[PDB]
Amino acid sequence: EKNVSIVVAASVLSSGIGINGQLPWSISEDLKFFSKITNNKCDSNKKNALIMGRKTWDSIGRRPLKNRIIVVISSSLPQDEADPNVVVFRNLEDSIENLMNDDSIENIFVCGGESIYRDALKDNFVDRIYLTRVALEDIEFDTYFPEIPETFLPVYMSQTFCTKNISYDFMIFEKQEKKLKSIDDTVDLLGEIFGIRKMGNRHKFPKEEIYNTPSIRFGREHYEFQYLDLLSRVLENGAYRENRTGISTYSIFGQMMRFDMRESFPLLTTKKVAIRSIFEELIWFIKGDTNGNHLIEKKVYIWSGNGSKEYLERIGLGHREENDLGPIYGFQWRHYNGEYKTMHDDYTGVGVDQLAKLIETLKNNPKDRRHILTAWNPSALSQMALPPCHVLSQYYVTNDNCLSCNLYQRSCDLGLGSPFNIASYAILTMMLAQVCGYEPGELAIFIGDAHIYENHLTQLKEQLSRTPRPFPQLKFKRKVENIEDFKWEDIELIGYYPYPTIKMDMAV
Amino acid sequence: EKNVSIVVAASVLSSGIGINGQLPWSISEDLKFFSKITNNKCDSNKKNALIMGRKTWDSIGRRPLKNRIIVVISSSLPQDEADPNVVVFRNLEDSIENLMNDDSIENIFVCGGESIYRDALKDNFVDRIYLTRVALEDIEFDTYFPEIPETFLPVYMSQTFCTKNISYDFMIFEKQEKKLKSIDDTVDLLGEIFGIRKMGNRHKFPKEEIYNTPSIRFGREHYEFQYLDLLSRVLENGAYRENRTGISTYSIFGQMMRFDMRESFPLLTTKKVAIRSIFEELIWFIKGDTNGNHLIEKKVYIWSGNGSKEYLERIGLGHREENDLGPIYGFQWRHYNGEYKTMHDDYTGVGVDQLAKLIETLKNNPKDRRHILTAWNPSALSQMALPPCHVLSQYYVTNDNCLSCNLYQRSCDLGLGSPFNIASYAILTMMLAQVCGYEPGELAIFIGDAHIYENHLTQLKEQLSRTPRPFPQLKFKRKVENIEDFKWEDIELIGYYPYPTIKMDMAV
């Protein structure tokens, strides 16, 4: 009784693994992953066996792998004993003789194509699966990886990596079996004595029925869980509260999310996020614009709700034009403390150009601690059609010339605003990184009133049922002179294979 | 072979447990803790044995405890078999015949005073310790709890609680024995392939030699660990970087801390924090003052460094008076966007009184999401002697009438500034809570440039060697009409028993 693991690199959707006797891709780090998993052993005087089919044995040049014993499953290969690092068996069942008899073998690994993968799962020989999901689907395949049986459950999902603009994950699947210990009891008993006085009870762990992929307990490395587990945490501890709109929310205070931008782009995969509208809003801010029609003219109606004549007169802005949102994001960025008249006037030169100073400070004094771009100005809050949600952001240049970003958000619509704020400030960091000459780094979002609107409950609960997929890659097609020169055609979204879009109405 | 645990509630320093045949305090929740700990059993048809001395047996009225068998260790009590829930033995060793003979007993608990505690530890009969540390030490004791031997190591430390303004902790100590498994290996191998491309390697777990009380792995509930583990994370991942001063730091980006204020006060115990100077700085901000002499007149020299004539002329403020810090904290609070002349002029009425609007909004509109108090004003940054470190703060009223606080900090001097910012915004939250009529809630601090100055290394490593003690209680002695009426004599610090103060020089 030893371990029998499966190592495979399959496509994210169709689970393709090969085409015309070779791989559909060339990822160097994945092969190194195959090296270390198949070499990882405990006994020095032992070797791991790698089982593969003849067609696969041909694909790897018919040459042995160092420090490993290759087991070829071929119906017509000569069982020659000359090579001690390569042995041939007639069928897969008879080849699993090393478990009980061959004590010189520590672990067993299955990695030999569809015919061996499917036969190893249909006969219940497998104990664990090492799946390398690759974000490639608009190509051709002829050999696929079988559907993972119900007996297996994911226990680990690595962060999204990148090689030649190709995103990929690393997952572990374990087979279900049958059916520190004192610390958990003492914390529970303290939770029974102090009701909500103990802070642990105020932040209860999300229940299994609202935890996204609850089988992955200790291996929640994928940074989309930083958003999906916040949804779960709100569903568990959110207090039903009212607000300025008629749609009440479930709200918790003081939450944070953390995303990687070096090897991926934090665009959610559990729901098709309108990436174009995110950009057009961001470049709208950068340009210094407050005209709400300029987004509607580009078929982006995100600010149409808070920019209706009925809404502005309702909040005391009847003198304002239809979509004159007022000094908001992109007016405190480019013209801070500037006397706001209307959205048609020329504001060139007035105010404090924070973005310009931010860019110039990022390149002249990178290790400066004051790379701050704020939007909360109490003098102009009364003029705003909606006070800023993402109020203040700070930027950081690491020693390896990477640009990280921190953002504080006073109010976070986890249904709609959060998927936008994650991608919006990710693109803004990448934009700042290119103009300043650095690489994208990490993105951390600090949240105050993290909430879910009550009409988003059935929708977001559906989103939590979708096991996430690797983040896509976002690369720019050209280097721009100034930051405002970016256009939608300059962005290339690579490997975005999300779940179907989810409709949720905005609370005006 | 079953488990033998000891349950004790001792004072935090001298470990006193009794005086004149009774307890030195009256904490109801502690007795309820003793109830659930001694009753926690797995078998329905089994009872836990509670061992105690005669003097202790007298202290509890000589009456049995429900669902439990009390074992009295007395040299001259009659071994009466009339009561089946109380049995008497002559010595402690002979009383431990429940391990091998009486299978009707599941667990054994030692809880019978000094004479039984010392004999149970000197003879190595104990397997686990349930310690309830109480923050009372300036009273009299006559019975103490023996010092925990080196064979025991702490594995859990609960959050600081409160009963009648008495702070107390719950800890677990386990005796050392001799000397999921696949997920950790796969993450390690991914760390060998991707160097710093994998985000996990940029946030490596702190090594044991810099982890405060590294024996407490899964039970780091005490929220002083939210600060001590930030020190460890900086020591592990901090990049050596320069700054505006000559003292280089080790800095990491995007960290957060979370403290409880309902049942405790987040004043660090691993170092004697100058609590008075914290208050005088805070009330200085609230009053709207920017005159540095008003703190020096009260023997508070924290802002003396950034207010020397040599420093102001060094940063381009030679025209400024000796300690005229300029529009800083407490001038953007009370007079935001107010044209700052000097520190002697009258600024009453000018600017935007954020604090006044914040107070008025906190009680009139509690579920508002705009309870924000900012200090980052780009128009006046050049006039400031030092840009704001704690830039923006947001406040939140829960459904149970508690006031929580969020704070974003752009730069964090973990040696000096951080212990002050934790207590300063804790006091400010409590002050706002009393004036508005709410109770203190949670305090979350979000940090950008969390760093340690290199001249603080020997000191902070010393601070990490001190296992923390329960937080003290801070209560106000009177209700004030306006928030500015607070005085140092109005604050009462209850149960603060910290480790000796640690001297660290400020980087000017």
Ligand SMILES: NC(=O)C1=CN([C@@H]2O[C@H](COP(=O)(O)OP(=O)(O)OC[C@H]3O[C@@H](n4cnc5c(N)ncnc54)[C@H](OP(=O)(O)O)[C@@H]3O)[C@@H](O)[C@H]2O)C=CC1
């Ligand atoms: N992405 C990835 O992780 C991997 C991808 N691949 C790719 O998959 C493709 C190859 O897989 P595939 O097409 O399925 O072919 P296989 O690799 O599964 O090899 C099949 C051969 O093995 C022998 N064989 C298989 N099953 C039996 C059996 N039950 N009894 C006796 N002999 C058996 C036969 O050899 P014989 O002719 O002697 O009868 C058969 O032709 C290639 O493109 C390869 O590159 C391969 C491995 C990993």
Ligand SMILES: NC(=O)C1=CN([C@@H]2O[C@H](COP(=O)(O)OP(=O)(O)OC[C@H]3O[C@@H](n4cnc5c(N)ncnc54)[C@H](OP(=O)(O)O)[C@@H]3O)[C@@H](O)[C@H]2O)C=CC1
């Ligand atoms: N804070 C806490 O968790 C607890 C506090 N306490 C406090 O501690 C105080 C009492 O403890 P303490 O003063 O140490 O007295 P003890 O509770 O330890 O009881 C001592 C008695 O037990 C008997 N005894 C002890 N050792 C032996 C032995 N080796 N052989 C035979 N008999 C023995 C003797 O009884 P005899 O007279 O018959 O010889 C002795 O007088 C009280 O104030 C009590 O409130 C007690 C328990 C818990």
Ligand SMILES: CN(Cc1cnc2nc(N)nc(N)c2n1)c1ccc(C(=O)N[C@@H](CCC(=O)O)C(=O)O)cc1
């Ligand atoms: C059978 N096969 C196809 C193949 C390709 N990619 C995969 N990727 C994964 N995740 N899992 C597999 N089973 C897998 N199999 C192989 C097997 C070994 C090598 C190989 O070259 N291994 C070298 C790797 C060289 C290097 O370090 O990059 C080794 O040392 O083991 C390539 C393809």
Ligand SMILES: CN(Cc1cnc2nc(N)nc(N)c2n1)c1ccc(C(=O)N[C@@H](CCC(=O)O)C(=O)O)cc1
């Ligand atoms: C021996 N002793 C002294 C005493 C007091 N406080 C302690 N506190 C701790 N943490 N540990 C002890 N061993 C301890 N012992 C005792 C024992 C039981 C009760 C007691 O009244 N127990 C009731 C508790 C009643 C209630 O629920 O509040 C029970 O149901 O067990 C009081 C003092």
Ligand SMILES: Nc1nc2[nH]cc(Cc3ccc(C(=O)N[C@H](CCC(=O)O)C(=O)O)cc3)c2c(=O)[nH]1
């Ligand atoms: N109460 C409230 N006011 C807001 N003002 C501006 C925004 C940002 C915003 C506005 C609209 C959408 C929106 O409806 N977007 C959809 C996609 C919705 C989705 O994520 O499925 C789209 O326009 O394509 C998203 C963010 C916003 C919000 O979320 N909530």
Ligand SMILES: Nc1nc2[nH]cc(Cc3ccc(C(=O)N[C@H](CCC(=O)O)C(=O)O)cc3)c2c(=O)[nH]1
């Ligand atoms: N570069 C820099 N500038 C600062 N300006 C104001 C502060 C906050 C500050 C300043 C001085 C002290 C200080 O010296 N405090 C000592 C004790 C220091 C301590 O051990 O905590 C005291 O006031 O008694 C503490 C915080 C501060 C800081 O930390 N770093």
Ligand SMILES: O=c1[nH]c(=O)n([C@H]2C[C@H](O)[C@@H](COP(=O)(O)O)O2)cc1F
């Ligand atoms: O970028 C945005 N992100 C976001 O989360 N919101 C949502 C948060 C909240 O649901 C609403 C503002 O409501 P309130 O004014 O009460 O904070 O806007 C809006 C944006 F423009």
Ligand SMILES: O=c1[nH]c(=O)n([C@H]2C[C@H](O)[C@@H](COP(=O)(O)O)O2)cc1F
């Ligand atoms: O309340 C404070 N908190 C704090 O952390 N600092 C430290 C942080 C940093 O070490 C220094 C400011 O340096 P810089 O202006 O380059 O960010 O002041 C100062 C305060 F007044």
